[PDB]
Each structure stands twice: as C-alpha cells, then as structure tokens.
Amino acid sequence: SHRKYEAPRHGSLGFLPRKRAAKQRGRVKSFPKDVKSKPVALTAFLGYKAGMTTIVRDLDRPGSKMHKREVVEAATVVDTPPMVVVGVVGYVETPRGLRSLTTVWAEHLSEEVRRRFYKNWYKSKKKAFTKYSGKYATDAKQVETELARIKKYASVVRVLAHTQIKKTPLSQKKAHLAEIQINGGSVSDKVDWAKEHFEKEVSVDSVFEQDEMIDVIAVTKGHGFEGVTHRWGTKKLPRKTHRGLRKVACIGAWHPANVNWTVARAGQNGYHHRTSINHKVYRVGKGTDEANGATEFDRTKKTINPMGGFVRYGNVNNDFVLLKGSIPGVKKRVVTLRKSLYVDTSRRAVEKVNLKWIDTASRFGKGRFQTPAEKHAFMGTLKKDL
Amino acid sequence: LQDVVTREYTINLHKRLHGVNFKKRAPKAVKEIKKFATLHMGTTDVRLDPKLNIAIWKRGVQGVENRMRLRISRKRNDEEDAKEKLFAYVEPVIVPSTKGLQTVVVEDD
Amino acid sequence: VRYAATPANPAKSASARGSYLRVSFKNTRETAQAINGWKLEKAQKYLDQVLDHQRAIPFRRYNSSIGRTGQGKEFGVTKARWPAKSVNFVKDLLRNAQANAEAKGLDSSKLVISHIQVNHAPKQRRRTYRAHGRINAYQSTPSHIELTLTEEQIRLNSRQRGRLASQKRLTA
Amino acid sequence: ANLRTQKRLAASVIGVGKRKVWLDPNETTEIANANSRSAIRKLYKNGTIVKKPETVHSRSRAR
RNA sequence: UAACGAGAUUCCCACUGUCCCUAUCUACUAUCUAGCGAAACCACAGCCAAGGGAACGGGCUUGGCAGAAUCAGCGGGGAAAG
RNA sequence: UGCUGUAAAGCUGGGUCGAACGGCCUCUAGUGCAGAUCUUGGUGGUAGUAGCAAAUAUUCAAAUGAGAACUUUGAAGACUGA
RNA sequence: GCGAGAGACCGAUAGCGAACAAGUACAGUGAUGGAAAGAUGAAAAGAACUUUGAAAAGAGAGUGAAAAAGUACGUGAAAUUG
C-alpha cells in the first residue's frame, strides 16, 4: 500500500557511500579545461584552514534592500605559504583514459618533502632521491631526454608541488605534495614553464586574484560511527517506543526480500571528501604586511590574527586567502583551492569586494577588544602592570 | 648519566584528571603519578610513599590538588630476581604553594 | 604413555606432558600453533613478550567474534590475543622439556619445537541457574598438552634402444 | 600473619569494638603467638595492643 | 442527590521536549583486554531476477553474476524461534 | 590388501588384541532400523560467543607466600546513620 | 515362607527396581516416587631411586608375558577433536 502522506526522502543519494575518504588530503577530481590562448598559469593551490572570522562590507547589489548598506559576514582564513615546484608529469591521451608517461624531478628536494616518502624517517638512512640526484651528473642529459619525451608525447602537463609546512604552526613535518595541472600555452610552453620553476616558490598571488570565485576541495569533519537520526536526519520515534527511538521504524517492505541500498542505516559520519564551489575571495593578504587586518576604513595597525591567536591553530604569519562563508574541513586541514570550472557572469560573481573592517577579537571567549592597546586603554593599568 | 638521582617535580594533576569519573579521581591520580615517574625515570617499577597516598586522599575521593610537588629518586634494586634494574621512589614535598616552582635536582647530602 | 608423534631420533629429542590441565582448550591450541616449529629459545622470548602485551598470539581457527588488533600484522592476521593462562602452562611444559633435554645432554641453543599438540581432556561439570527455574551446564574444557623438543634407471624397448644406438652412430 | 583471631579477642578483653583495637604492625610475631585472652591482656598492658581513641563528636556547634 | 472515588468522559487555566525539531550532558552497558563461560536453535545450507511448480524457491530451468579471512551494527528475508 | 556374488553378503592381506570360535545338514526365536516432537547414553556447531553492569568506593605500604586487585596488619578515604 | 534340583531362558540400556554399602542415594508436607553404578594383573609385583617443578605432574628408571594393562585400569567402535 502507498504511503498515507508524501514526503521527500532524507539525505542525498548522490553522496553515497558515506565512507571515510581514502586520503586525508583532498584530491582534485577535475581541473579547469585547458585553453591554449591563455598564458601559462597554475590552476590550484594548497593551504591550511586557519579559522573563521567576521568582516564588515558594504553590499553592492542594486535592487536589494541591503544595497549600499553594511552587511556582517562570516569569513574563513586559509594560511597559504608559497608552494615549491619539484616535479613535472606528462599525461598521454589513450583510449583507456589519461596515462602518466614520464615524471621528471628537480635536482634538489627539501627535507620536508623527502619526509613524505618515509613512514619511519628517524630510523632511515634517508636514501630517497640520492641516485636520482646523481643523475644530474654535470650534464643532466637524462633529464633533458625525459623532458623532450614529455614535450613530444604528452597532452596534459601537471606540476608536482609541495607546501612549506615548516612555515605554519603545525607540528607536522611532512610536507603535502600534489599534482597541479598547468593550463595555457602549448605542451612545450608548459614544460618550459615547469622546468624554469623547479625549486622555486609560487605564491597564491600568482594563482588567485581578489573577488574571484574558487572551489574548495577538502575532507570534512569526522564524527565516527553515527546513528540514523543524526546521520540522515530522520524523524525520532515517539517517546513510549520499546527498545529505543533513534531508529528508522521500517527498513523495507517484505519484497524485495532484501534491504535496499536507499534505506538509512547507521554508519560512519563525516570525514568525507567534498568539493564546494563558488566561494568569493575577499582578500589575498601578504605575510610581509604588518597590517593584514587593516582596511581603508579601519587603519588600525593590525594583523589577521585574533587575540590569543587562532584557537587550536596558532598565528597566520604567511600569505593568506580570506574567503567568504564556510569551507569543508577542520582547523589545520590541508585545503585545495581550485579555479572555477565555468564562467559565472552573475552579479554575485562579478562583484568587487571592499572590506570595511575585520574582526580580530579573541576567539577563545567572549572577546571584547580588537587589540591589546585597546584593551589597556579601556581597562587602564592592572596590578600586574605595576 | 647517573642512575641514582633525586629531583623535585611539579605534576599538573588538574589537566590529567580532566573528565575523570568522580569516584576514580583519587585512584586515577595514583596511576597518573606512576605513569609520570616512568616518563622521567624510565622505570616501570614505581613505589609510592604511604605519606603520598595520604596527600592524594586528604580531600576525599575527588578532591585531588591541582598541583603536587614530588621528590622522585631513582634507586638501585638489589633484589633478585629484580627484572627491573632501577626503581623510582615518590614521596611528597611540603611547600607553602605549588605555583612557580621548576624542576630542581636534589643533592643527597 | 604413547605420544602422538614419535621422534625420528629418540636420542636427540626430549618430551614433556601435561594432562587434565584446567586451561581453555581453544586458547591453548592457538598458543601451541603459534610456536610450532620454532627454536626453543626463540619461542621463550616470544612467550614473554605476549605476557607483556608487546606481541600477540594469532587466533586462526577459534576466532569467531573476537577483537581486531594491530599486533596481528606480524602473522598476517587481524584477530590476535594475549592468553595469559595458556602461555603460562606452555612455558611450564617448555621448561620441563628443556630440563628433560639437559639431563640427556642436549644443547638448549639447538633445540627446536618439532612437535606440540593439544587434545581435549574430560570436562568438569558445574551448574548455572537460569530464568524460570532452569539448570544449564557450566562446564570447563581442559587440555592434554604434549610437546617434543629436537635438535637440528631406464629400460628401453627394442626400437627405443635401436633409435638410441643409431643416433649415437651419427655423433662419430 | 592472620591476626583475625587476635583482633577479635582483643576487642572483648579491652571492651571496645574491633574498630577501636590497634595491633602493632611491627609486632606481628609477638601478636601471632598471643592465642589466649591471658596473652592478650599482657600485650594490652605493654602497649602492643592499644585502644584507639574514640572519634570526637563535638557538641560545640549545637551549643 | 451533598460527600466520597488510583472508576469513565468533555472543556478551561497553569504547566511543560507530547510536539514544531531536535541538540547537548552524566553514570552503567554495549566496545577492547585477562579470567570464567552457557542457551534457544540446527535435513543440508545460505546472492539475486523471471519462469514453471502444492498457483509467493536457497536449491529446479534460463539469465545476472561470482575472489580468501573477517569486525561493529541492523532488523528486509530465512513464509526465523517459542 | 584384495577377491567372489546383480545384491543381501562371504572370504582374505596388514595392524591391534588375548580366549574362545566357526563351516555344513536340520531345529528354534525377544532375529536385520534412518526416521516414530522414538528411549537411554554420549558428542558437536552456535562459541571463546551471550554474558559475568542494582545495593555511592576504594587507595598506599608492610608481612605471609612459588605466586597477592581479592589473605592479614597499619595508614587513609568511605558508607550503614539507632 | 523354608529347602532343593533344573532349563533350546537373560547376559550388565538385557534379566527382578536392585549381579555393586538397592528399596540404597535422592525428591516430596505427606500418601508415595526412586536411580546410576560389574571386569588391571596369575600375583600389587600398585612404579623403589634420580632429576625438573611450589605442587599436581613430567622425564628417566623400575615391576610385569604385556604399562599398546597404571586403579581417569580387559578389548576400546562411532559421533567429535588434535
């Protein structure tokens, strides 16, 4: 018999299976389509979710009640120290899909990226890439041969770049190494750009502009094993139900004599790989700026860091990206920032953003001062100050 | 490296007993102190002075002090079979306040 | 008594027995299989680490709905345990057989556990009390343990012969 | 090393409950040989067995 | 028919997680370990679809398929057990 | 280990074992088991699984001892609360 | 009941309920109900002594025609197990 009353189903079938991500680093499933006319530029970057903050902004949206009126918005900070190019990979079109043909590494690799290849670094002889480094013996003709192979045969060129995690407050010493597709120009141009950038740093300023819409690739917050009521948002059973109420009452009809895949079951929650799209870049701050959090209206000599630092992160002392809203992942998560896959001409996307003020009160409590100087001015001298 | 050595430590028992069942806080402070001494003396054999047991339990089963000053001395175990060459002895130090004290090596004289 | 397996050379072997031992049979079988074929001194170090929870006994047959652990990777399994009562009996019989071999003049450094096996012993019956006034069984499953330490033309046809002979003539 | 009997005897000789009997932990051999009430009396007189003071219940706040 | 009622019923005020619509917290379990250690039940066993068939198959016929060993849950089926 | 017989079965090689037993002609019967929610006894899978969770709460040391969460003693912390 | 002699009777789940300290152990307020349980060897000759172990035991040895007879005792099947 039919349901007495119709209702939409709980949860999406487009995000099954709700299992843990295979890797903690989010991987870019798809890169922006390559346009030969454009200049050779990267398409993705790796940063670290520092924390959330608050901004104030005059909304520029004609026809809205908030047009030319201040809006308070949540923002997320992504600590993005420059990435180091260490390798280049060539991909060949085949009837069975893209296939990596050749990988060429840089002559010298930093220790933090060589740790990536070790599960027990402290007990190793640290032999990684030693013979390969020797392959640069005064002529590097093997490297040139591989680069010529990539130029001749490859159709997609990606660059192997790693983060400089030692510049972040994280205690992890392994760098994060990822493939970033290179767009623009011919394959020869892409390989020349990759070779000319070995062991060099690339900053976010050369990848992302302000007011851009970008995508965020990350693994969400884990919650462990979870019941159907919170995992799927189903209705709790009445109070007087025997054997408990945080269940789904009927998990199927008699026929099919099986449990359907579309029925909500308890299982692992969170820690899923997610791609979130259309996040506006409110700010691209520089680590060398001593007034990161200062705007054209709040000239306070102020960094992006709140009072007491970011809770469970530390301080953002590097170049950073300030994005609108929330992104998947937790604090300290490595986050992949990708360029938009399509051209959005909507007013929300083409808007120019000018920030009025950035919140730097302590996140560790009901903070009520933006700066220690402000705190002292408001409170006066304390007993510890003498 | 000297095997026989005496030092005074401050243990932040408050952060170690966080969230612990109220009827186990003093029992767990005994286990935490034993685990603390192994971290420093490298010995699985830790002996607690009975006066230390009095100090832990002086305010009932959940009134463990936030900080305790301990004098941990590593001694040689002559017993055979010892199966643990050294052992740690923990006995309490009476101080007016347990705040602002650093680790100090004690000279047995 | 007759042991299940007789040693190939009785002069280079020593045996130990334990009967009606009140230890779980299923636990003892797994701990006996974990050291079968090992060096005697190698197995004694292993059995001490199992008591310390540094290494585990892989449970291979009697392992239904037991926990998973990382210490089972040493044996390529996911289910392993640290059965103390079973390890202590086995260590007792290993020490007896080692002392048996020393009295023979054998060398403990060269001893190998060539044969160890566990059999069922007669059960011990107790009672448990169930709802609605019912009595069930509460038996024990004892073990018999025994272990032994050891030191470490062609005929051809007429025409097969004929073919062979004629080929040999070709080669001078 | 099983002074359960001696503590029961000492409670009756002293006239208090077993909760108020103190057996010297250093005199275990001496107390273990005190099998009779006569032997318990000597240990009580010598101080090997001590009648612990009653726990104080002050009436000061009631007053 | 006053009074009385762990009697049945309707409405009103108060009150409230009964609900919108859930969330968080604590103890004891469950979980993992050492020791101890049952019972119900059991033809053989245990993946689906359709067919025909004692007219609702785990097995038969025709297809889909199909890769050791498993852990925590769960309550569709075993026309589950009693 | 084989052989014989369509079969019911019979005979044999090897091993174990220790005191009686067979063929043939007849006689006789409490004479042939897979089932009876059969009877009695035994043994499994389940399964090292369910579980061993009410009654506030235990800890340190010494002794004894092959061995001590559980015995004794001391110190403490508790409770029953006439 | 007492005392004898026999059998094409049964042969330890059979034969009396009882081949045994059987109308016993045990159950029930009571009337009553009511089992299980035979076999080392010719003879205990029932394992002295040494060794490992806290001990039980084990390994040697010894007795014996046999320990493939060790009182958990003739043979020692099947289920089930190593």
mmCIF file of C-alpha atoms in Angstrom, chain B:
data_model
loop_
_atom_site.group_PDB
_atom_site.id
_atom_site.type_symbol
_atom_site.label_atom_id
_atom_site.label_comp_id
_atom_site.label_asym_id
_atom_site.label_seq_id
_atom_site.Cartn_x
_atom_site.Cartn_y
_atom_site.Cartn_z
ATOM 1 C CA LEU B 1 74.310 9.969 33.039
ATOM 2 C CA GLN B 2 73.888 8.995 36.694
ATOM 3 C CA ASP B 3 71.476 6.181 37.512
ATOM 4 C CA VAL B 4 70.968 7.293 41.127
ATOM 5 C CA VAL B 5 69.489 10.794 41.096
ATOM 6 C CA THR B 6 66.881 12.772 43.019
ATOM 7 C CA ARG B 7 64.779 15.564 41.539
ATOM 8 C CA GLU B 8 61.729 17.571 42.547
ATOM 9 C CA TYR B 9 58.927 17.905 40.018
ATOM 10 C CA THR B 10 55.562 19.596 39.840
ATOM 11 C CA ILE B 11 52.833 17.473 38.271
ATOM 12 C CA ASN B 12 49.776 19.229 36.855
ATOM 13 C CA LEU B 13 47.266 16.680 38.090
ATOM 14 C CA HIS B 14 44.393 19.008 37.196
ATOM 15 C CA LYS B 15 44.823 18.530 33.450
ATOM 16 C CA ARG B 16 45.463 14.802 33.852
ATOM 17 C CA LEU B 17 42.232 14.255 35.802
ATOM 18 C CA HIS B 18 40.049 16.160 33.342
ATOM 19 C CA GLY B 19 36.703 14.483 32.739
ATOM 20 C CA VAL B 20 37.513 11.564 35.023
ATOM 21 C CA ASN B 21 34.733 9.768 36.893
ATOM 22 C CA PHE B 22 34.343 11.441 40.269
ATOM 23 C CA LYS B 23 34.702 8.176 42.167
ATOM 24 C CA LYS B 24 38.005 7.431 40.417
ATOM 25 C CA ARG B 25 39.812 10.780 40.571
ATOM 26 C CA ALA B 26 41.991 9.917 43.546
ATOM 27 C CA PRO B 27 42.509 6.316 42.342
ATOM 28 C CA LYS B 28 43.496 7.637 38.921
ATOM 29 C CA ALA B 29 45.864 10.218 40.386
ATOM 30 C CA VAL B 30 47.756 7.247 41.818
ATOM 31 C CA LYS B 31 48.046 5.724 38.347
ATOM 32 C CA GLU B 32 48.871 9.090 36.778
ATOM 33 C CA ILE B 33 51.672 9.651 39.279
ATOM 34 C CA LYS B 34 53.082 6.209 38.498
ATOM 35 C CA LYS B 35 52.907 6.977 34.781
ATOM 36 C CA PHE B 36 54.504 10.376 35.412
ATOM 37 C CA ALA B 37 57.502 8.845 37.180
ATOM 38 C CA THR B 38 58.116 6.378 34.351
ATOM 39 C CA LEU B 39 58.199 9.250 31.850
ATOM 40 C CA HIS B 40 61.038 10.814 33.835
ATOM 41 C CA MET B 41 62.921 7.935 35.465
ATOM 42 C CA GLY B 42 62.390 5.458 32.632
ATOM 43 C CA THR B 43 61.354 2.802 35.148
ATOM 44 C CA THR B 44 58.224 0.669 35.171
ATOM 45 C CA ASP B 45 58.888 -0.003 38.880
ATOM 46 C CA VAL B 46 57.427 2.960 40.775
ATOM 47 C CA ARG B 47 56.849 2.868 44.531
ATOM 48 C CA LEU B 48 54.648 5.431 46.256
ATOM 49 C CA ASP B 49 55.399 6.622 49.759
ATOM 50 C CA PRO B 50 52.406 5.943 52.038
ATOM 51 C CA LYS B 51 52.569 9.603 53.033
ATOM 52 C CA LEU B 52 51.955 10.399 49.366
ATOM 53 C CA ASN B 53 48.803 8.283 49.442
ATOM 54 C CA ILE B 54 47.675 10.396 52.393
ATOM 55 C CA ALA B 55 48.329 13.601 50.452
ATOM 56 C CA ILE B 56 46.283 12.444 47.457
ATOM 57 C CA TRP B 57 43.315 11.357 49.576
ATOM 58 C CA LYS B 58 43.348 14.219 52.081
ATOM 59 C CA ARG B 59 40.242 15.775 50.499
ATOM 60 C CA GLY B 60 38.318 12.622 49.689
ATOM 61 C CA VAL B 61 37.949 10.669 46.506
ATOM 62 C CA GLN B 62 37.706 13.652 44.136
ATOM 63 C CA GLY B 63 39.482 16.489 45.927
ATOM 64 C CA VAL B 64 42.885 15.946 44.358
ATOM 65 C CA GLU B 65 45.008 19.084 44.340
ATOM 66 C CA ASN B 66 45.660 20.817 41.038
ATOM 67 C CA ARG B 67 49.422 20.590 41.565
ATOM 68 C CA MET B 68 51.603 18.384 43.743
ATOM 69 C CA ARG B 69 55.314 18.696 44.414
ATOM 70 C CA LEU B 70 57.005 15.300 44.264
ATOM 71 C CA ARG B 71 60.524 14.207 45.130
ATOM 72 C CA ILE B 72 61.291 11.333 42.768
ATOM 73 C CA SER B 73 64.518 9.456 43.465
ATOM 74 C CA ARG B 74 65.823 6.633 41.293
ATOM 75 C CA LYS B 75 67.291 3.848 43.424
ATOM 76 C CA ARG B 76 69.065 0.604 42.630
ATOM 77 C CA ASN B 77 67.052 -2.585 43.035
ATOM 78 C CA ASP B 78 69.251 -5.183 44.725
ATOM 79 C CA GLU B 79 66.513 -7.833 44.916
ATOM 80 C CA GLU B 80 66.940 -10.917 42.740
ATOM 81 C CA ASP B 81 65.363 -11.529 40.505
ATOM 82 C CA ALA B 82 64.670 -7.822 40.077
ATOM 83 C CA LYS B 83 63.723 -7.926 36.350
ATOM 84 C CA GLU B 84 63.879 -4.111 36.605
ATOM 85 C CA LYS B 85 67.340 -2.824 37.434
ATOM 86 C CA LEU B 86 66.341 0.547 38.902
ATOM 87 C CA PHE B 87 63.164 1.782 40.532
ATOM 88 C CA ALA B 88 61.583 5.130 41.322
ATOM 89 C CA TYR B 89 60.501 6.267 44.777
ATOM 90 C CA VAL B 90 57.948 9.079 45.022
ATOM 91 C CA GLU B 91 57.368 10.919 48.284
ATOM 92 C CA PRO B 92 55.648 14.267 48.833
ATOM 93 C CA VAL B 93 57.292 17.634 49.362
ATOM 94 C CA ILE B 94 55.580 20.169 51.618
ATOM 95 C CA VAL B 95 55.684 23.659 50.090
ATOM 96 C CA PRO B 96 53.635 26.760 51.008
ATOM 97 C CA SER B 97 52.374 26.968 47.416
ATOM 98 C CA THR B 98 52.803 24.738 44.371
ATOM 99 C CA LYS B 99 52.990 27.671 41.936
ATOM 100 C CA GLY B 100 56.102 28.966 40.213
ATOM 101 C CA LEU B 101 58.330 26.016 41.135
ATOM 102 C CA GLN B 102 60.549 24.460 38.476
ATOM 103 C CA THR B 103 62.208 21.072 38.311
ATOM 104 C CA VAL B 104 65.163 21.019 40.705
ATOM 105 C CA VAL B 105 67.858 18.383 41.155
ATOM 106 C CA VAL B 106 68.215 17.431 44.823
ATOM 107 C CA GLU B 107 71.662 16.688 46.255
ATOM 108 C CA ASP B 108 71.515 13.742 48.669
ATOM 109 C CA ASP B 109 73.706 15.065 51.487
#
